Amino acid sequence: PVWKDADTTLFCASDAKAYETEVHNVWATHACVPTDPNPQEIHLENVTENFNMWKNNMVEQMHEDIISLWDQSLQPCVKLTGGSVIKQACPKISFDPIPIHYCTPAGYVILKCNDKNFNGTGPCKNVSSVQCTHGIKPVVSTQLLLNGSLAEEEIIIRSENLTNNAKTIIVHLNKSVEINCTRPSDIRKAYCEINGTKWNKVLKQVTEKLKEHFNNKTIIFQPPSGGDLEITMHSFNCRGEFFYCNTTQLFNNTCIGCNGTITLPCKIKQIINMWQGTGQAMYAPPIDGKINCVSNITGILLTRDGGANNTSNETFRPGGGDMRDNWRSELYKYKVVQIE
Ligand SMILES: NCCNC(=O)N1CCC[C@H](C(=O)Nc2ccc(Cl)c(F)c2)C1
Ligand SMILES: *[C@@H]1O[C@H](CO)[C@@H](O)[C@H](O)[C@H]1NC(C)=O
Ligand SMILES: *[C@@H]1O[C@H](CO)[C@@H](O)[C@H](O)[C@H]1NC(C)=O
Ligand SMILES: *[C@@H]1O[C@H](CO)[C@@H](O)[C@H](O)[C@H]1NC(C)=O
Ligand SMILES: *[C@@H]1O[C@H](CO)[C@@H](O)[C@H](O)[C@H]1NC(C)=O
Ligand SMILES: *[C@@H]1O[C@H](CO)[C@@H](O)[C@H](O)[C@H]1NC(C)=O
Ligand SMILES: *[C@@H]1O[C@H](CO)[C@@H](O)[C@H](O)[C@H]1NC(C)=O
Ligand SMILES: *[C@@H]1O[C@H](CO)[C@@H](O)[C@H](O)[C@H]1NC(C)=O
Ligand SMILES: *[C@@H]1O[C@H](CO)[C@@H](O)[C@H](O)[C@H]1NC(C)=O
Ligand SMILES: *[C@@H]1O[C@H](CO)[C@@H](O)[C@H](O)[C@H]1NC(C)=O
Ligand SMILES: *[C@@H]1O[C@H](CO)[C@@H](O)[C@H](O)[C@H]1NC(C)=O
CATH class of the missing domain: 2.170.40.20 (Human immunodeficiency virus 1, Gp160, envelope glycoprotein)
Incomplete structure (x- = not known):
């Protein structure tokens, strides 16, 4: 037709x-x-x-x-x-x-x-x-895209314009990475266990893939340096509880003695900056007992640093918010x- x-x-x-x-x-x-x-x-x-x-x-x-x-x-x-x-x-x-x-x-x-x-x-x-x-x-999450589909061939880099550093970069993984996050029986104390071995491997692959798009330049990962807790941390909702997990161990350029399981520290926040823009809201304290979610990390949201035009490298930090x-x-x- x-x-x-x-x-x-x-x-x-x-x-x-x-x-x-x-x-x-x-x-x-x-x-x-x-x-x-x-x-x-x-x-x-x-x-x-x-x-x-x-x-x-x-x-x-x-x-x-x-x-x-x-x-x-x-x-x-x-x-x-x-x-x-x-x-x-x-x-x-x-x-x-x-x-x-x-x-x-x-x-x-x-x-x-x-x-x-x-x-x-x-x-x-x-x-x-x-x-x-x-x-x-x-x-609903930041930095790490959870429980989505995978690219069936290579790892894919998506951006409306990679030359603009204000444009969010979406990396579609071809291999899911598990992030297992618990609040067992401070009640807001929580943590995320990720296989450092698999994670480091696929980040090197992202590194590889990102280098293609950037004329073989040096690719470096960094934590967010500015923003609300929701975007500087890996935010997501598990069973009604808003989770805030520190990503600094997953974006260390050291390992791109470190192949075991990474343990990201987490907090369950009751006062959150709502992602709809409206403002800020408060919720009740967490449920009794074990609060746990096992998710698949299928993509990563990242922002390139500006001002590296005649620099040796490119700097990428975990992103999100939109x-x-x-x-x-x-x-x-x-x-x-x-x-x-
Ligand atoms: N490039 C767009 C900038 N984004 C932005 O300005 N926002 C306003 C303030 C923070 C907002 C937020 O992400 N909230 C949130 C709440 C709960 C969960 Cl689970 C979550 F994953 C995220 C987003
Ligand atoms: C996690 O990924 C595997 C394949 O990598 C898939 O079979 C499984 O259904 C995924 N789990 C969820 C909850 O999406
Ligand atoms: C087109 O896509 C289909 C479905 O994803 C798949 O079988 C194959 O990659 C393509 N098939 C043909 C005939 O081009
Ligand atoms: C994922 O993509 C990379 C290239 O970006 C490739 O080297 C690797 O073999 C792929 N892995 C799978 C499981 O498809
Ligand atoms: C996506 O592919 C198109 C060609 O179809 C190209 O113009 C564009 O630069 C590509 N973007 C990325 C991020 O690879
Ligand atoms: C991409 O962004 C750069 C810098 O913001 C801009 O100069 C350019 O016009 C945009 N589009 C293309 C196709 O380069
Ligand atoms: C997730 O972690 C908890 C505690 O860390 C453990 O009891 C559970 O077996 C793990 N689940 C998976 C699927 O790895
Ligand atoms: C880490 O993942 C690898 C697969 O690449 C697997 O050998 C192992 O089960 C995982 N690590 C642990 C401690 O379970
Ligand atoms: C980028 O580096 C790769 C390394 O394998 C090389 O093959 C390629 O020639 C370099 N860039 C271009 C534009 O060819
Ligand atoms: C994440 O942890 C590092 C230390 O591992 C700390 O320096 C940093 O401030 C933490 N991130 C935030 C947003 O607090
Ligand atoms: C991902 O899917 C699994 C299985 O459906 C679920 O238990 C988990 O809560 C999901 N993760 C998130 C962040 O919703």
């Missing part, structure tokens, strides 16, 4: 258990339809489509949905919002992101890039066409068009 680049309102789908008390299931149970029981994907032969992950409206729409999900599902005791302040009940909630499918209404279709080393921008020569994206888990980049990391291979 034929089509034309177009933006329209998408709808969502899920496998939300209607009996579930969990907040992602509850939101999906009443804001999304059931997943396509017979999903039909059909490859388009001799067709080349130009995709642009950084200028894609599916990002902004999914981002809209996640603010909605969080605003109805999270119960802070007090919300400080731009001069207003609201007290409330803050019961414990059950939190565990479920995949969400995004789907075009009639008159529109979703194009999907299957070029395996597609970097997100430019043309794609193996294009399919779907009614619905795949199941995307909306995991969580459209997180949706970016899974919606890059997709584009919405209207059948003409």
Whole structure:
């Protein structure tokens, strides 16, 4: 057939258990339809489509949905919002992101890039066409992208413009790294155990890959030097508890006696700078007992340092804050068009 680049309102789908008390299931149970029981994907032969992950409206729409999900599902005791302040009940909630499918209404279709080393921008020569994206888990975090998909070939570097150092860099890993984070039975004391062996290996590979994009220059990793706790640390939510974990051991250029298990120190903060921008909020103290999540690190968000134009090296620090980049990391291979 034929089509034309177009933006329209998408709808969502899920496998939300209607009996579930969990907040992602509850939101999906009443804001999304059931997943396509017979999903039909059909490859388009001799067709080349130009995709642009950084200028894609599916990002902004999914981002809209996640603010909605969080605003109805999270119960802070007090919300400080731009001069207003609201007290409330803050019961414990059950939190565990479920995949969400995004789907075009009639008159529109979703194009999907299957070029395996597609970097997100430019043309794609193996294009399919779907009614619905795949199941995307909306995991909220900084620096480390958790529980996502992997690049099926090489490690991929994505940025709207690598020459601009204000542009976030998204590295898509081809090998997942486990991050196992516990708060066992100070109650906010917590920690993350990562296999230093595997981690160091793939960071060297990132290093390798990054050097390609930077004329063989020297690649150096550093901790963030400026920003709120949420972006200077690895922030994420595990079972309703906001985790803040120190990344300094995972970005030491020493090991790019150090192959055991890295133990990142962590704190469970009750007062957080909300990622939606609204302000700052307070929550109740953590649950009794063992609070643990085992996640897959599938990508890394990084920022290059400015002012290295005639310098010997390039400096990269873990990044985050704009969580459209997180949706970016899974919606890059997709584009919405209207059948003409
Ligand atoms: N390049 C964009 C700059 N980003 C920015 O200015 N923000 C405003 C202040 C910090 C905000 C934040 O990231 N919050 C947060 C909360 C909970 C979790 Cl779990 C998490 F992963 C993150 C983001
Ligand atoms: C196109 O992508 C499909 C699905 O990812 C995969 O089988 C292969 O890489 C490509 N197939 C052809 C015929 O080009
Ligand atoms: C992505 O690929 C396009 C060519 O399709 C190229 O113009 C662009 O520089 C590449 N970007 C990165 C970050 O590799
Ligand atoms: C972690 O990664 C493996 C493959 O590396 C995958 O099979 C598994 O489902 C992933 N776990 C989660 C929770 O996504
Ligand atoms: C991941 O990509 C790197 C190149 O970036 C490659 O050397 C390595 O073999 C890949 N690993 C896997 C498991 O695909
Ligand atoms: C990328 O960023 C640099 C520096 O901000 C800018 O000079 C340039 O115009 C941008 N785009 C390209 C294609 O280089
Ligand atoms: C995660 O760590 C805890 C304590 O550090 C341990 O009991 C548990 O077996 C670990 N789980 C995995 C999957 O490694
Ligand atoms: C670290 O990961 C490697 C795989 O590369 C594996 O040999 C080992 O199980 C892991 N380390 C520990 C202490 O379990
Ligand atoms: C960058 O270094 C690699 C090292 O393997 C070399 O092969 C390559 O020639 C260098 N750069 C360019 C632009 O060729
Ligand atoms: C992370 O830990 C290092 C020491 O290991 C410390 O110097 C640094 O201040 C910590 N980061 C933050 C944001 O506090
Ligand atoms: C990643 O997925 C696993 C398995 O579904 C889950 O236990 C864990 O909480 C997830 N991690 C995050 C940060 O949501």
